[PDB]
RNA sequence: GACUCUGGCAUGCUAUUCUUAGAGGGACAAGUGGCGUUCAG
């Protein structure tokens, strides 16, 4: 049983909000995992990138906790990246899954040559930066596949990017900065401004503003 | 059997300590002033609150089990004459120049004071 | 003879001088001094308590807000003023007192407000401090009823309305010389010299103006005709972003912004007293400094310390290796 | 965005900033969509229509959101000249 | 004001502004607030232009009126001078007041007793109330702020240039904001003066409370 | 089952006393007499 706390969770629990993209339209903070669970559901698969055991320092001593790096992904749509340190490995894994569900972002997909069929590749060459780690994504001709390291390959496969050339720079041995740089590059795929998006934006009513009469009763 | 819930307990304690004056002995008058007072989700919670507060006002008026009314009396104090309504108010020459530029140069309450 | 709390703070044993001694409960019970409560149970009991009338406190407030002193007054102060008013009205005829007092007369000078005039030890070009004069230096010292007020606001209102008041000296006083703080943006005067923000518009803009009130009831105040006083030199500077938490110190722009609590420890604020009878038994001549506590590591300082550092303009150049807290 | 066949091949079209024409991101949680009321020109009472301005989070960071909203209000006739 | 003759500043409003001292700004100046000042006088005090104050107040009232649910407006004061006025503003409008301590995590920490999600933020002082500005930056809340001359304009959308250090000026600004919101909605007539006088919105200062209970 | 939701009766509002389906009411131990630490029951 899900008992929502936020107004957004209340609207998602009912049928006032129909799609996730509306919440992405107004850049509202998704503070509950059950919203992503309700919208995407069984289409979300999870893939644990890495488990590192580490020794937490305490005056009691050096005691072990595990740190989970998990990339969750809705295919031909969305990714999320989660990092969680916890006592048990299963608790850390589910916490990283929750934190990756809270960080689900959309990815924009374009065409390499002429626009035939569904989009397959990154629209323009973008860059993601995290702690001296640079990940560059370049559009690729159809049928190439993801040409990258295994971790950005994992992220781009869960993004639904069918094909993308990649170039990395820096200490790519550390997995956290490399995965976060790839995630930042994926975010800047859609944050980029292109000549397609040059129309003046007509402003749709806000979800809190549209359904405020329903939210009076709750 | 039946028992009272703790949320009803704390809400009725708030209602007793806040607005005991307008509360009385009738059930429906207590219910309507209760739905007038607070932020209120549900009908059944309101009716449980009204019944519990009615029973405990049957209780406490037999025997025990003032600051907030004085506080709100101090809070809504209204003077007979507004402190803004002054006969002659001091004004700077630069403030007078600003008023003249803003077209309010025909005032009667201003007195220009030069920096001595 | 209405005794204000200032006489009780100064151990003014003028009980033999007067006979109509009248006091308020809330001008004697609030004193936190131990010696005053000690001597209170020792002093002869001929003082008696009397309550003013609401009409007379109303009238006293009515002309006190016309004098421009009403924000500076306190409730027990109005009790003392209206008690003296009621006593002089009920004993002496009421025709002596005058209401709606006189206007101000402005006469400025070239002297700075910080000129050290009327300080006892200070002498320009003889003024000496003798042990024959240590009992003499109280204030500007010059029949039946009077007051024992030490505050200038009380003397000001009592002398504007017309009562003869006195001091710790047995003789009645003649002139009142003091300073007041005047806002130079809103032109509102406050008799409380301790405050730094004005009550009306709240800016850090109060400046010193000297006031002399004669025995007639006429007041004249001197401004300073000096360009240094009204100078906008060290006033505009770039401010930091407001920080929160338990450790953040703010540049103190309003009189009532909530500062975090950063107090000193007891050992850090002990000052050595040297005339104690058991001081000579101390292994050290001085109270030991506090370095162990967390307040010492946070460099918490007293409000008194660092006063001339605030008076420097921020748009200047300090020493290269010094840091201003 | 739009393929050769003509379908809008895109998840959703993002809003752009009203002042600096930059795309508001999906997790730009400092971004603002503000509505300012319109009034009747004879009585000055609320009409029911409103004008909508969107400001990105960077302009709100820089402190230029106030000047941008004021400039748009002067442009749309909400704020009078001088 | 859209150059509407009904919405212009009148003589009584100007007299009120001069009586409180809203034109008397601070002594320091932030460079982004230089658009709202008139002139620098000789002794250092910055003069706040009252027409810009009126226009920004009308813009703020229009922004508040455009919020359909009156409880979606959150009105917060931290220091004492605004406190009563904020409560009184709620009595004028129905907006949700926070007087006293603003608990951090009010707008971001969802599992809390005092967690609330507004739609418009109105702030007495940007310097004192920096924490709700940060939370509003986190949760997409537009900000109204009663800004002085020395007030940072980070994360505010409508800055009202006025003196906010004195109790009379703060109470006057809140009272005219409430009056303009009620006039803009239409529940009170613009021709008749409002029956609530602005002295209801001022700070009480308990020693002055003792002095006023004395003269009764 | 001291957890969550919820029914009986509407000649009331909504496209409406006989069929509908949204909302708003109505029930809360509310009142009475006994047993009761005179309060929990
Ligand atoms: Zn002032």
Numbering used by the authors:
A (entry chain C): 59 to 276
B (entry chain R): 2 to 66, 73 to 123
C (entry chain y): 7 to 131, 206 to 222, 230 to 412
D (entry chain V): 1 to 82
E (entry chain A): 2 to 217
Mind quoting what the paper says about this structure?
Biogenesis of the small ribosomal subunit in eukaryotes starts in the nucleolus with the formation of a 90S precursor and ends in the cytoplasm. Here, we elucidate the enigmatic structural transitions of assembly intermediates from human and yeast cells during the nucleoplasmic maturation phase. After dissociation of all 90S factors, the 40S body adopts a close-to-mature conformation, whereas the 3' major domain, later forming the 40S head, remains entirely immature. By combining yeast and human structures, we uncovered 16 different pre-40S assembly intermediates, most of which represent the long-sought nucleoplasmic pre-40S ribosome.
Several factors have been reported as nuclear export adapters for the pre-40S ribosome, including LTV1, SLX9, RIOK2 and RRP12 (38,39,42,44), which are all present in our RRP12 state.
